[PDB]
Symmetry: D3
Subunit: 97 residues, 6 copies
């Protein structure tokens, strides 16, 4: 067990508990199509952290071509990092239909 | 704007705030390389949600070739959903090196 | 100052912080009308707590004429309390229009 | 299901989980009078958001005459909003006895 | 830096943020003595974790002579751990005076 | 029941729920030595709040000689408070072996 692993654990557990808590309440109210549509993209987004000189800190793979920057945080980070939140373009494509 | 977008916005802001707060406190103590290392995989993990009949709810594209399941939640979800948290196998490979 | 006041203070600050943070991020993307619409009913919902013998614990004045129960929690509370979350029926009426 | 509804859901669930978690711990320790007195006003407070020109964004009804501003947030919101947290005057009247 | 250190850092930052936020809101309303009184024991409580075989997991030095168990959690932990929250008996002594 | 007690309750419950949630996930994955080593010092750290004139607001006892300042917050508090987070020196001594 390492710090990196414990940090991943904390994100995972955040998401697990949110998903389970939500379902406990919404299952009767929303249809299956509704709840499944709600969770389709949940958690799929990631932050690309770019350092102050343009060097990407976040590990990325070839997938990135199919992702779209949805939200941006700039000028807030004390090391001059830029944070971009990227989600599947497929989500926007399905919304448009 | 939609509910889905707002949900994405909530995950985004959670991670933007976490990253910026941490950097504010750790900046002095850790080296840039140490913080970069800390954030290399931060937020790259995602959940794969499977319903009780084995049908995947989460959008999936590409392959899980280079992914590994870090954590699983089963038996907790009201709908019988299984939740798996997947991360880059590269992270684990790099821990070896 | 009392415990009750401090509890009220905690709910207050939670909502003040949520509103201000959201506005900070969404300001650019959404129109003022869109954000106003988003916040029209934000925090107007309240809980009505009923004990296991049907006696209401929450202060109530006025009438529930123009309220609707949006969400209920039963069978979870250690004391056998039932919890109902009530919101303005106007919100739902306006969703129709 | 809409964004507005999901947002209400998030407030409701916050309150439900807090109330139930608290009761799980305090029921043995506090008397019934104690815990019921603690929850009498819990969640009844709301924020009145006023825009930068004096126009109230929050929906309000006639009830407002029986409410009292307990806490105020000003100069923090990036759209120049003023946030006022209002609770039943009845709470202050009962404290004074 | 280690996982243990990072965990300590997370508890630290939680309390730093809580203290500073509260002071920001309560500063005007309460007197310095009132806020000082509020924070006299804030964060001095600690948990003692005992495994199912009665062996203490938490580091302990000194004595519990002048401590009191304020809250206990049993029967909830997957490993059969018992959790006790210990605070200065002085706090309770001062509430009498 | 007083505000001070309710505030202690909130810290206690935060820690209890974190410890139990973590164990629910990590017990299978980490060894007993691992999880027990993780929790050895958890919650043992405290904040020493010093007012703007050098007067310590936090109650402290003789124990303090065996504690070490791990993290510091300065210049953020609106009353000019200094916050120092102190942990057992024993933790650092065990890390070094
Ligand atoms: K992700
Ligand atoms: K309310
Ligand atoms: K502590």
């Amino acid at each position: 067990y390492t710090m990196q692993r414990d940090n991943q654990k904390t994100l995972a557990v955040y998401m697990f508990e949110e998903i389970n808590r939500d379902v406990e309440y919404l299952s009767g109210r929303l249809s299956e199509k509704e709840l499944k549509d709600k969770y389709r993209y949940y958690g799929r987004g990631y932050v690309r952290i770019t350092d102050k000189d343009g060097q990407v800190i976040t590990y990325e793979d070839g997938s990135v071509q199919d992702k779209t920057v949805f939200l941006t945080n700039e000028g807030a980070n004390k090391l001059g990092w830029k944070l971009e939140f990227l989600i599947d373009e497929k989500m926007f494509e399905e919304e448009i239909l």
